[PDB]
Design a protein around this ligand. Structure first.
Ligand SMILES: CCCCCCCCCCCCCCCCCCCC(=O)O[C@H](COC(=O)CCCCCCCCCCCCCC)COP(=O)(O)OCCN
Ligand SMILES: *[C@@H]1O[C@H](CO)[C@@H](O[C@@H]2O[C@H](CO)[C@@H](O)[C@H](O)[C@H]2NC(C)=O)[C@H](O)[C@H]1NC(C)=O
Ligand SMILES: *[C@@H]1O[C@H](CO)[C@@H](O[C@@H]2O[C@H](CO)[C@@H](O)[C@H](O)[C@H]2NC(C)=O)[C@H](O)[C@H]1NC(C)=O
Ligand SMILES: *[C@@H]1O[C@H](CO)[C@@H](O)[C@H](O)[C@H]1NC(C)=O
Length: 173
């Protein structure tokens, strides 16, 4: 519906062993799969939407996102008490409404099936979704809000890159 939605589920049995499963849909059709442990992560386009050189660039940046994501969970563990095993769910995307002056974009993170933090994209700030203050949540937010990587680069990815991908490829669906 002029939208790209991406889902990443990350199963941590311990800080150093993670299992990934995810997928992306474009206009409500499955277009990408994420699969495998950190030791060997498969990231696939089901439909050849990007040309080889282009997709290879996109794929390298996804792998790099994963490495930094994993580093942040180990850091939270390394600095606060983080109880494993745990499952993290990242749900993110962009939507072009027919009646919209702006894309709607989002990035929502849950832990163990409960709301944890989410991204306020235009101001490029992360917020807690948990009702109670927690050293884990507070420390995570401190990390997410302190660096350009998790603020301004992510805003660009959701507002610019995702939206330009929808405009460029929805007609294929
Ligand atoms: C185009 C579309 C292509 C389709 C791809 C489909 C693949 C299957 C979908 C599953 C994967 C989800 C993808 C996530 C996208 C990441 C985007 C990205 O690379 O952005 C970078 C910005 O850094 C960041 O965004 C850093 C964020 C790091 C932390 C994220 C927050 C999670 C917090 C939870 C931590 C755990 C808390 C502890 C309990 C560089 O962007 P660019 O250079 O590409 O532009
Ligand atoms: C990723 O794949 C999962 C698994 O198929 C999708 O989850 C399904 O979502 C639909 C809603 O449209 C439900 O009817 C199913 O019950 C869900 N399945 C499971 C196992 O939970 C998910 O929507 C996909 N996400 C993308 C591509 O962004
Ligand atoms: C996420 O869920 C798992 C399982 O539901 C939690 O693991 C439990 O942790 C407590 C204390 O660390 C143990 O007494 C239980 O036996 C564990 N259960 C299992 C199945 O291993 C985990 O602690 C949760 N983590 C967070 C951060 O919510
Ligand atoms: C990684 O896993 C995929 C799963 O299909 C496999 O095809 C590929 O050969 C593996 N690559 C490695 C182990 O370097």
């Amino acid at each position: 519906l002029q939208r790209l939605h991406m889902l990443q589920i990350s199963y941590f049995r311990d800080p150093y062993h993670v299992w990934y499963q995810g997928n992306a849909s474009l206009g409500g059709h499955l277009t990408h799969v994420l699969e495998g442990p950190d030791t060997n992560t498969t990231i696939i386009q089901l439909q050849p939407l990007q040309e080889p050189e282009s997709w290879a660039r996109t794929q390298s940046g996804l792998q790099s996102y994963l490495l930094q994501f994993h580093g942040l969970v180990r850091l939270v563990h390394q600095e606060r008490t983080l109880a494993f095993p745990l499952t993290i769910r990242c749900f993110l995307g962009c939507e072009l409404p027919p009646e919209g002056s702006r894309a709607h974009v989002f990035f929502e993170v849950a832990v163990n099936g409960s709301s944890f933090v989410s991204f306020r994209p235009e101001r490029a700030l992360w917020q807690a979704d948990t009702q109670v203050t927690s050293g884990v949540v507070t420390f995570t937010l401190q990390q997410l809000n302190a660096y350009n990587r998790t603020r301004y680069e992510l805003r660009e990815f959701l507002e610019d890159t995702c939206v330009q991908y929808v405009q460029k490829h929805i007609s294929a669906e």
